């Protein structure tokens, strides 16, 4: 979507973007599996299991 | 570009004739300053050509 | 049509001259017809017609019968615009003093009679009478009396005795006064009677008298008999939306004056008592004074609104309004603004301008160019054609833009580079594209900053935007020769990334033909970019007579530096691309390029560097993640260790082994010395982090950590932000400065906790507010600088003085701060400088000391150069090109006409926004003492006895590379002229700022703890006991001995009693006063002092400015002087220096002078041009004073011209003024 | 705000100082297309004529 | 797209007289009173003047000679 500048962190400490990106990548990776099991219509077992 | 009631008009009428040449006049703000100073007990004037 | 502006007193008849009528009824537009009323404040008959070429009655409408006063209304049908020129007057009934000539600090009417102000103010309020022209009676000519005093006084002398009360009295006193006879009497009172008290006001009263006569205007005019009114167009009553009318406060005040004058006349003819009429007279005076200047008597408020109405004088002065927001700065047509962005593809000379913006801007060009090419019938049709956005008009716009430079401006304009001319590049959208290389000069970011565009009109303004303001013409700043165009963040990072090498890159150590093959290796994906590969490269180097000779050979390099070599120009060698290529390296490479190949090559080199940088810095990955920050695994320990190091100090203070302010430092020192541990833990682990096997042998090299390359390249990340990034971030202190004994112990990666963030919040707030509220400070400083500078321009070819300031390197304490070569480069010699052997010539009398002579003098041991300066230059109302120097966007001599004053003021004002044991010799040489008295003692070694003592080092060259000061009673181990080893301790003893600073340095303010100076040589002596303070006598040697002084005993001394001490000696400690530095030393000593001090505050942080600029300010500070004798002559230095020297060329005796020291704000006060003074200074005062004197301004300068709207006498305007002024007055 | 897939990396200086480089996909899905509502009214009022 | 006038200044190096002279010449070509002395490669009068300066075939002195000639030219048409 967007391409920022890496040089924009190490001056103004502002490290919140760094970790917001990692946590958001993980939070979207979980949704990847949720959407896969929704599209593959596997069953209601794997849904709860995950 | 600011003052000179004649300057704006002359420059505009020249810009369309392909002639880029200004005819500077007298900034109207300065004539107004002359009024505001001369309306006081101060007499301001101009001399030779 | 004019070349002189004069200001004189307004006479009660010269007022009736302008006035086209007498406003009688205090009325306006009627109420129901909205038409002007007869003899009102808007009367068409008095002032002018309502409509254009139309009468108020409506009988004459045609433009035919113009000059005629229709007997119906008396309104001459003419241009309605004349209602702006139409003055008027009011026949005031009782005389009324002009407030300006009574309230200004040098109260004009006050010292016009030597009458104290508190007396005239009592006379005006009708609270006391005053005698006038007694002749021969019991009373004087000027004497006050009360009710009971005037009661039985007329009986004593009915005739020959007159005594009035109020404004009539003041006026008639000014009428019968002789400004001639009294003057002849005040001449002797200044002649015989000594005692400055007898000369305080007299020396300024004689001047007011003689000038009051020389001008011509009479003293009776100090009282306004007729009050002139302002044209109704300068105080409109115009209607508005909804029907409400919008008027000016000038109206309300005028209406008041008219009402009260009418009421007074009605009483005077109605036979009223005195208690009523004397109240009416005072109300009239109140209204008139509040009309001229509201805020000096009682601040008469307005009507329904509580806010005080604005008076006449208030419409002139102040940063707001006229003279400051009108005549110096106005809004302009043919302009715009927008949010600016990137634009790398653009060249260093072009900028992206949004299409629609260009359309709206060049509308007047578009219309004409369309009607010319047979595409639009007439101008109106072209308007509709562009209003419809027809396809053809886009190509027409592209034809009009073609080579038509535009101007871009960044909101705060510190230096001249704030406005730069670029070549338009039509672009889609609404954002303004800006070239990254110029972002430094503009000092702008892409976080939402906006810039303004300006379109030139005249062919001149289009040429000046190409040969003066164009981007590619401004490369090296005028403040300092360093280029203002240096690669920023991404560029330097890409280059540094290429110019790197690890050890084991894919295919390293091999050989290739050259750059072509190296790039064939990189792009293919077969070779790396950081390989240590050595290849062949042809490095051109024009040699031996100026003939280019390409010497090809092989060198050790990397695959990356060899590729970057394809951008490098011809003349430059390969040694410039053999390093890590940091920001501080790319910059100097570009600088050598500039002063080797010229302007034209340097430009294209910079553009190429930018493109290549951005590309490579992009494709290198070059990112940052959470794992990049390497928290030293030793952190935990390093923390807890120093965390327990205080547990002993705590008991040390709990028992009584150390007091509070004693164990405080015990915590502070262990914490400061422990922070280096945690800071260096990640540092030495991050400067050699990456570990790889060279061909199969484990080894560590310069780390490749993403965060670290950004530091070693200088791209963005500095060093401190790294210690904050991975380790804990230091200790903060409360606003008190009490550093807390509770440092931060957690880093930024782990995350701060609630408690720790509070102290960070205070630190943040202090930084934020201290930087935000500082804007106005730096702005104010540079503003006063430009106001002291402007008129100073480069006119004269050569002055003709050998004087020259004495340039010597700063060498101080340990090592040099700035070599002699810098403070002498590009300047001019004053006297022939020779080799270390006398009777030689290394350089002739005066010659441009460009790089060549710099190297030549650097070869020899000559560390002392005599360079001419602006502080000393024989020139009237200007400067000579030689004395200034050369520094500019070029290495050539300063041109004849550039206004060096403004550029210097900016050169100091822009860097303003950045500011807030024994001795151990290092180098080997010989001890060379300077100005020291010594004596042998028990130990046999030497000891200093003079407080001042310099410790130079005469090496095998004969120069000085060491300079240390040693206090009284020191331990010496060599002596003067003695050999030393590699760092021998020859000294030992028992030791027992910012922008507000430079402000004081310029203002010549007197120090808090001054230090007395000597006025002559000879043994000093004491004197009378302690009475109030103390005494001190001066004992000269041969000449007269009348000098002495009183120095308080509560202030310790330093000078030796029975010892010779030359003039200008340290009679005490403490700071020094520049005024006292001019008298006892001279004109060069004081400038050498101010420059050396002001340069230190800037030298602290990363600021560099050639001494030349500061010299110009110093020269402007001593433009005044005081005369010692009278001589054959009948103040300004230049004027008297020419006027008395022309008669001194004649056998007649000259008159001696003494330079005075005026601060930048006190020197900007006195100026030949009164208009330029009243522009920024206290207008109300300046005009009053320059009005009683009948002063006459011929403008001769910059600000005055921009006021009257004329070509400034500088640069392009200086050539026009040259051709005009030549035949002018000749 | 909105969820944007960010990636810290330079791109031909298109972001150079603090400028932001956005994909075309974003401006296509109308995920930042903010709606505005201006209010411009006309006023017929009695005049001198 | 005239970017740098370095060589143009070299002929008259004053940096201001350049502008005055080039403006006189640019007028001559724009406000119709003369013809170009260099092949006009779509270049504006502003740039063509600087190019004439560069070639060394136009300056203050040369134009002062030409105008002085036309001074007598205007008097040789009145008998
Ligand atoms: Mg910003
Ligand atoms: Zn009439
Ligand atoms: Zn000089």
Residue ranges of E strands in C282-323: none
Tell me how many degrees the CA angle C1196-C1200-C1203 measures, rounded to the nearest 5. 145
How buried is C552 (Cβ within 10 angstroms: 0-12 exposed, 13-18 middle, 19+ buried)? exposed
Q: How far apart are the first and last CA of chain E?
A: 48
> What is the Cα–Cα distance from C668 to C733, expressed in whole angstroms?
12
With contact defined as beta carbons under 8 Å apart, do C928 and C934 qualify?
no
How buried is C818 (Cβ within 10 angstroms: 0-12 exposed, 13-18 middle, 19+ buried)? middle
Q: How far apart are the first and last CA of chain A?
A: 28
Q: At C260, is the secondary structure helix, strand, or coil? A: helix
Q: Which residues contact C1125 (CB under 8 A, 6 or more apart)?
A: C1151, C1152
Closest Cβ–Cβ partner in B22, B42, B48 for C7:
B42
> What is the Cα–Cα distance from C717 to C1138, expressed in whole angstroms?
59
Give the domain E1-79 fold: Eukaryotic RPB6 RNA polymerase subunit (3.90.940)
Residue D7 tokens read as 């990636």
How buried is C697 (Cβ within 10 angstroms: 0-12 exposed, 13-18 middle, 19+ buried)? exposed
Closest Cβ–Cβ partner in D8, D25, D26 for A4:
D8
Judged by a CB distance cut-off of 8 A, whether residue E65 touches chain B is no
Q: At C993, is the secondary structure helix, strand, or coil? A: coil
Ligand with minimal distance to C450 CA? 1
Residue C918 tokens read as 């024994």
Structural domain containing residue C945: 925-988
How does DSSP assign C186-239, residue by residue? HHHHTTS--SGGGGTTHHHHHHHHHHHHHH---GGGGEEEEEEEPPTTTS---B
Q: Which residues contact C55 (CB under 8 A, 6 or more apart)?
A: C44, C49, C61, C70, C72, C73, C75, C77
- The answer, yes or no, to whether E and D have at least 3 beta-carbon pairs within 8 Å is no
Beta bridge partners of C1121: C1155
With contact defined as beta carbons under 8 Å apart, do C970 and C942 qualify?
no
DSSP at C838: S
Q: Which residues contact B27 (CB under 8 A, 6 or more apart)?
A: B2, B3, B4, C327, C330, C1203, C1204, C1205
Q: Which residues of C644-653 are buried (b: 16+ CB within 10 A; e: fewer)?
A: eebeebeeeb
C-alpha separations of C799 from C605, C803, C846, C1137, C1222 in Å: 40, 11, 12, 14, 20
Q: For residue C305, report the phi and psi dihedrals to the nearest 5 degrees.
A: -80, 145
Q: For residue C808, report the phi and psi dihedrals to the nearest 5 degrees.
A: -135, 145
Distance C1106 CA to ligand 3 centre (A): 17
C775-789 and C995-1003 are packed helices; what angle lies between their axes, rounded to 10 degrees?
30
With contact defined as beta carbons under 8 Å apart, do C232 and C41 qualify?
yes
Q: Which residues contact C281 (CB under 8 A, 6 or more apart)?
A: C94, C126, C166, C167, C264
Q: Flag whether C351 is marked binding.
A: no
Q: For residue C446, report the phi and psi dihedrals to the nearest 5 degrees.
A: -110, 40
> What is the Cα–Cα distance from C1226 to C358, expressed in whole angstroms?
48
DSSP at C139: S
CA A24, A25, A26, A32 torsion-angle sign:
positive
Residue that has been written with the tokens 């309605």 in this structure: C80
| Closest alpha carbon to C99 in C293, C254, C252 | C293
Residue that has been written with the tokens 């102290």 in this structure: C759
With contact defined as beta carbons under 8 Å apart, do C495 and C487 qualify?
yes
Q: How far apart are the first and last CA of chain C?
A: 18
- Nearest residue of E to residue C475 by CA position? E4
CATH of the domain at C734: 1.10.132.30
> What is the Cα–Cα distance from A29 to A33, expressed in whole angstroms?
7
> What is the Cα–Cα distance from C140 to C131, expressed in whole angstroms?
7
> What is the Cα–Cα distance from C70 to C81, expressed in whole angstroms?
19
> What is the Cα–Cα distance from C73 to C1047, expressed in whole angstroms?
81
- Nearest residue of D to residue A1 by CA position? D5
> What is the Cα–Cα distance from C348 to C471, expressed in whole angstroms?
7
> What is the Cα–Cα distance from C745 to C742, expressed in whole angstroms?
9
Q: Spell out the alpha helix ranges (H) of C687-774.
A: 706-712, 720-726, 754-772
- Nearest residue of C to residue E25 by CA position? C459
Q: How many CB atoms lie within 10 A of CB C1044?
A: 13
Q: Flag whether C449 is marked binding.
A: yes
Beta bridge partners of C535: C555
> What is the Cα–Cα distance from C990 to C1133, expressed in whole angstroms?
50
C-alpha separations of A50 from A23, A33, C123, D10 in Å: 18, 9, 100, 37
Residue that has been written with the tokens 């009114």 in this structure: C229
Query: Quick check: D11 and A8 CB within 8 A?
Result: no
Query: Quick check: B35 and C368 CB within 8 A?
Result: no
With contact defined as beta carbons under 8 Å apart, do C203 and C160 qualify?
no
- Nearest residue of E to residue C463 by CA position? E19
Q: How many CB atoms lie within 10 A of CB C1062?
A: 10
How does DSSP assign C1144-1187, residue by residue? HHTTS----EEE----HHHHTTS-S-HHHHHHHS-HHHHHHHHH
Q: Which residues contact C903 (CB under 8 A, 6 or more apart)?
A: C416, C478, C1109
Q: For residue C409, report the phi and psi dihedrals to the nearest 5 degrees.
A: -135, 135
Chain A residues whose beta carbon lies within 8 Å of the beta carbon of residue D6: 1-4, 17, 21
How buried is C526 (Cβ within 10 angstroms: 0-12 exposed, 13-18 middle, 19+ buried)? exposed
Residue C1133 tokens read as 């230095």
| Closest alpha carbon to C343 in C478, C416, C451 | C451
Residue C752 tokens read as 């701060």
Q: Tell me whether strands C879-880 and C794-796 are parallel, antiparallel or unpaired.
A: parallel
Query: Quick check: C493 and A9 CB within 8 A?
Result: no
| Closest alpha carbon to C469 in C1118, C1216, C1211 | C1211
Edge-first strand order for the sheet with C5-9 is B42-46, C5-9, C1192-1193
* Max CA pair span of chain B: 48
Give me the residues of D, 10-49, that contact C with CB < 8 A: 10-19, 43, 45-46, 48
Distance B38 CA to ligand 2 centre (A): 29
Beta bridge partners of C453: C336, C408
Q: Which residues contact C20 (CB under 8 A, 6 or more apart)?
A: C46, C47, C86, C87, C88
Experimental method: X-ray
Beta bridge partners of C953: C927
Residue A4 tokens read as 């920022």
Distance C784 CA to ligand 3 centre (A): 25
| Closest alpha carbon to C934 in C903, C895, C879, C976 | C976
With contact defined as beta carbons under 8 Å apart, do C880 and C798 qualify?
yes
Beta bridge partners of C1045: C1032
- The answer, yes or no, to whether E and C have at least 3 beta-carbon pairs within 8 Å is yes
Q: Which residues contact C339 (CB under 8 A, 6 or more apart)?
A: C430, C431, C432, C448, C449, C450
> What is the Cα–Cα distance from C336 to C321, expressed in whole angstroms?
23
Q: Which residues contact C1022 (CB under 8 A, 6 or more apart)?
A: C1031, C1032, C1033, C1057
Query: Quick check: A15 and C490 CB within 8 A?
Result: no
Length of chain B: 49
Residue that has been written with the tokens 């522009």 in this structure: C1175
Residue C654 tokens read as 């709990």
> What is the Cα–Cα distance from C613 to C564, expressed in whole angstroms?
10
Query: Quick check: B38 and C18 CB within 8 A?
Result: yes
With contact defined as beta carbons under 8 Å apart, do C949 and C965 qualify?
yes
CATH of the domain at C931: 2.40.50.100
Q: Which residues contact C908 (CB under 8 A, 6 or more apart)?
A: C781, C782, C785, C998, C1105, C1109, C1110, C1113
Q: Which residues of C202-215 are buried (b: 16+ CB within 10 A; e: fewer)?
A: beebbebbeebeeb
Chain E residues whose beta carbon lies within 8 Å of the beta carbon of residue C897: 16
Q: Which residues contact C1072 (CB under 8 A, 6 or more apart)?
A: C1007, C1010, C1011, C1089
With contact defined as beta carbons under 8 Å apart, do C468 and B31 qualify?
no
Tell me how many degrees the CA angle C592-C593-C597 measures, rounded to the nearest 5. 120
Resolution (A): 3.8
C-alpha separations of C549 from A21, C542, C562, C571, C1200 in Å: 56, 5, 20, 10, 57
């Amino acid at each position: 979507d967007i391409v920022l500048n890496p040089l924009g962190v190490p001056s103004r400490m502002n490290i919140g973007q760094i970790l917001e990106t990692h946590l958001g990548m993980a939070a979207k990776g979980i949704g990847d599996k949720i959407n896969a099991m929704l599209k593959q219509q596997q069953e209601v077992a794997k849904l709860r299991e995950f | 570009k600011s003052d000179d009631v004649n300057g704006r008009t002359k420059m505009y009428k020249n810009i369309v004739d392909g002639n880029h040449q200004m005819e500077p006049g007298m900034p109207e703000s300065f004539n107004v300053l002359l009024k505001e100073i001369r309306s006081l007990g101060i007499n301001i004037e101009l001399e030779d050509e | 049509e004019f070349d002189a502006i004069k200001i004189a007193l307004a006479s009660p008849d010269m007022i009736r001259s302008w006035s086209f009528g007498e406003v009688k009824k205090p009325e306006t537009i009627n109420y129901r017809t909205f038409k002007p009323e007869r003899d009102g404040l808007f009367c068409a008959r008095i002032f002018g017609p309502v409509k254009d070429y139309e009468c108020l009655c409506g009988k004459y409408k045609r433009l035919k019968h113009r000059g005629v006063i229709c007997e119906k209304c008396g309104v001459e049908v003419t241009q309605t615009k004349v209602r702006r020129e139409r003055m008027g007057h009011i026949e005031l009934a009782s005389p009324t003093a002009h407030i300006w000539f009574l309230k200004s600090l040098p109260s004009r009417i006050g010292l016009l009679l030597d009458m104290p102000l508190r007396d005239i103010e009592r006379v005006l309020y009708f609270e006391s009478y005053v005698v006038i022209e007694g002749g021969m009676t019991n009373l004087e000519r000027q004497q006050i009396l009360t009710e009971e005093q005037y009661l039985d006084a007329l009986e004593e002398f009915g005739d020959e005795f007159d005594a009035k009360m109020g404004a009539e009295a003041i006026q008639a006193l000014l009428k019968s006064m002789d400004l001639e006879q009294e003057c002849e009497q005040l001449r002797e009172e200044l002649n015989e009677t000594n005692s400055e008290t007898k000369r305080k006001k007299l020396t300024k009263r004689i001047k007011l008298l003689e000038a009051f006569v020389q001008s011509g205007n009479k003293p009776e005019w100090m009282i306004l008999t007729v009050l002139p009114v302002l044209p109704p167009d300068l105080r409109p009553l115009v209607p508005l939306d909804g029907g409400r009318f919008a008027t000016s406060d000038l109206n309300d005040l005028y209406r008041r004056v008219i009402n009260r004058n009418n009421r007074l006349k009605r009483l005077l003819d109605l036979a009223a008592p005195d208690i009523i009429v004397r109240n009416e007279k005072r109300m009239l005076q109140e209204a008139v004074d509040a009309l001229l200047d509201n805020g000096r008597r009682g601040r008469a408020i307005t009507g329904s609104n509580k806010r005080p109405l604005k008076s006449l004088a208030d419409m002139i002065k102040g940063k707001q309004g006229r003279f400051r927001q009108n005549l110096l700065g106005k809004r302009v047509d043919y302009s715009g603004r927008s949010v600016i962005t990137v634009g790398p593809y653009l060249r260093l000379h072009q900028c992206g301008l949004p299409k629609k913006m260009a359309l709206e801007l060049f509308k007047p060009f578009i219309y004409g160019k369309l009607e010319l090419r047979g595409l639009a019938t007439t101008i109106k049709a072209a308007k509709k054609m562009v209003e419809r956005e027809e396809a053809v008009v886009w190509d027409i716009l592209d034809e009009v833009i073609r080579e038509h430079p535009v101007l871009l401006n960044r909101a705060p304009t510190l230096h001249r580079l704030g406005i730069q001319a670029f070549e338009p590049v039509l672009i889609e959208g609404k954002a303004i594209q800006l070239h990254p290389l110029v972002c430094a000069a503009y000092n702008a970011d892409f976080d939402g900053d906006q810039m303004a565009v300006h379109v030139p009109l005249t062919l001149e303004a289009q040429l000046e935007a190409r040969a003066l303001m164009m981007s590619t013409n401004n490369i090296l700043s005028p403040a300092n020769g360093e280029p203002i165009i240096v690669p920023s963040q991404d560029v330097v990072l890409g280059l540094y990334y290429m110019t790197r090498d690890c050890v084991n890159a894919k295919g390293e150590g091999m050989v290739l033909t050259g750059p072509k093959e190296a790039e064939r290796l990189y792009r293919s994906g077969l070779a790396s970019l950081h390989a240590r590969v050595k290849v062949r490269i042809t490095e051109y180097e024009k040699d031996a007579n100026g003939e280019l000779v390409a010497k090809t050979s092989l060198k050790d390099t990397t695959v990356g530096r060899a590729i970057l070599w394809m951008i490098v120009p011809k003349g430059l060698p390969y040694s410039i691309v053999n390093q890590a290529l940091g920001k501080k390296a790319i910059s100097k490479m570009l600088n050598t390029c500039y002063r080797i190949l010229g302007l034209k090559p340097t430009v294209i080199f910079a553009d190429q560097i930018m493109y290549t940088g951005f590309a490579y810095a992009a494709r290198s990955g070059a990112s940052v993640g959470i794992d990049d920050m390497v928290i030293p695994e030793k952190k935990h320990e390093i923390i807890s260790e120093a965390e327990a190091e205080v547990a002993e100090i705590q008991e040390q203070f709990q028992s009584g082994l150390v007091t509070a302010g004693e164990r405080y430092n015990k915590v502070i020192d262990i914490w400061a010395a422990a922070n280096d541990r945690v800071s260096k833990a990640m540092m030495d682990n991050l400067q050699t982090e990456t570990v790889i096997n060279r061909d199969g042998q484990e080894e560590k090299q310069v780390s490749f950590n993403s965060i670290y390359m950004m530091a070693d390249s200088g791209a963005r990340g500095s060093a401190a932000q790294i210690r904050q990034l991975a380790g804990m971030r230091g200790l903060m202190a409360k606003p008190d400065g009490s550093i807390i004994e509770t440092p931060i112990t957690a880093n930024f990666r782990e995350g701060l906790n609630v408690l720790q963030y509070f102290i960070s919040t205070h630190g943040a707030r202090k930084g934020l507010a201290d930087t935000a509220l500082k804007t106005a400070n730096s702005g104010y400083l540079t503003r006063r600088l430009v106001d002291v500078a402007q008129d100073l321009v480069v006119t004269e070819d050569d002055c003709g003085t050998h004087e020259g300031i004495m340039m010597t390197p700063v060498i101080e304490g340990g090592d040099v701060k700035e070599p002699l070569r810098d403070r002498v480069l590009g300047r001019v010699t004053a006297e022939d400088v020779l080799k270390p052997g006398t009777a030689d010539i290394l350089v002739p009398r005066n010659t441009l000391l460009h790089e060549q002579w710099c190297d030549l003098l650097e070869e020899n041991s000559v560390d002392a150069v005599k360079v001419r300066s602006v502080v000393s230059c024989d020139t009237d109302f200007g400067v000579c090109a030689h004395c200034y120097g050369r520094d500019l966007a070029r290495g050539h001599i300063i041109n004849k006409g550039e206004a060096i004053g403004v550029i210097a003021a900016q050169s100091i004002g822009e860097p303003g926004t950045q500011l807030t044991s024994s001795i151990q010799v290092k180098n080997k040489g010989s001890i060379k003492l300077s100005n020291v008295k010594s004596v042998v003692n028990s130990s046999g070694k030497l000891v200093i006895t003079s407080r001042n003592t310099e410790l130079k080092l005469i090496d095998e060259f004969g120069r000085t590379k060491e300079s240390y000061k040693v206090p009284y009673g020191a331990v010496l181990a060599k002596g003067d002229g003695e050999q030393v080893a590699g760092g021998e301790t020859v000294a030992n003893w028992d030791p027992h700022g910012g922008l507000p600073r430079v402000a004081d340095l310029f203002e010549a303010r007197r120090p808090k703890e001054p230090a007395i100076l000597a006025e002559i040589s000879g043994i000093v002596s004491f004197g009378k006991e302690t009475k109030g303070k103390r005494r001190l006598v001066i004992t000269p040697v041969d000449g007269s001995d009348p000098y002495e002084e009183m120095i308080p005993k509560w202030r310790q001394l330093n000078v030796f009693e029975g010892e010779r001490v030359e003039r200008g000696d340290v009679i005490s400690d403490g700071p020094e006063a520049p005024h006292d530095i001019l008298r006892l030393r001279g004109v060069h000593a004081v400038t050498r002092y101010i420059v050396n001090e002001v340069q230190d505050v800037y030298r602290l942080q990363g600021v560099k400015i050639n001494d030349k600029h500061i010299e110009v300010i110093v020269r402007q500070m001593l433009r005044k002087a005081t005369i010692v004798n009278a001589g054959s002559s009948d103040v300004e230095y230049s004027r008297v220096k020419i006027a008395n020297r022309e008669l001194e060329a004649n056998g007649k005796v000259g008159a001696t002078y003494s330079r005075d020291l005026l601060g930048i704000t006190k020197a900007s006060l006195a100026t030949e041009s009164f208009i330029s003074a009243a522009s920024f200074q206290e207008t109300t005062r300046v005009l009053t004073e320059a009005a009683v004197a009948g002063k006459r301004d011929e403008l001769r300068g910059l600000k005055e011209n921009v006021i009257v709207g004329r070509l400034i006498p500088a640069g392009t305007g200086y050539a026009y003024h040259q051709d005009r002024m030549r035949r002018r007055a000749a | 705000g909105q969820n944007m897939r960010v990636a810290f990396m330079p791109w031909n200086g298109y972001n150079f100082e603090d400028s932001i480089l956005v994909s075309e996909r974003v401006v296509q899905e109308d995920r930042f297309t903010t709606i505005h509502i201006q209010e411009l009214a006309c006023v017929s009022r009695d005049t001198k004529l | 797209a005239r970017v740098t006038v370095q060589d143009a200044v070299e002929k008259i190096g004053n940096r201001f007289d350049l502008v005055l002279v080039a403006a006189r010449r640019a007028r001559q070509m724009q406000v119709g009173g003369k013809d170009p002395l260099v092949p006009e490669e779509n270049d504006k009068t502003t740039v063509i003047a600087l190019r004439e300066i560069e070639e060394g075939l136009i300056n203050n002195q040369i134009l002062d000679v030409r105008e002085r000639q036309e001074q007598q030219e205007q008097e040789a048409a009145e008998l």
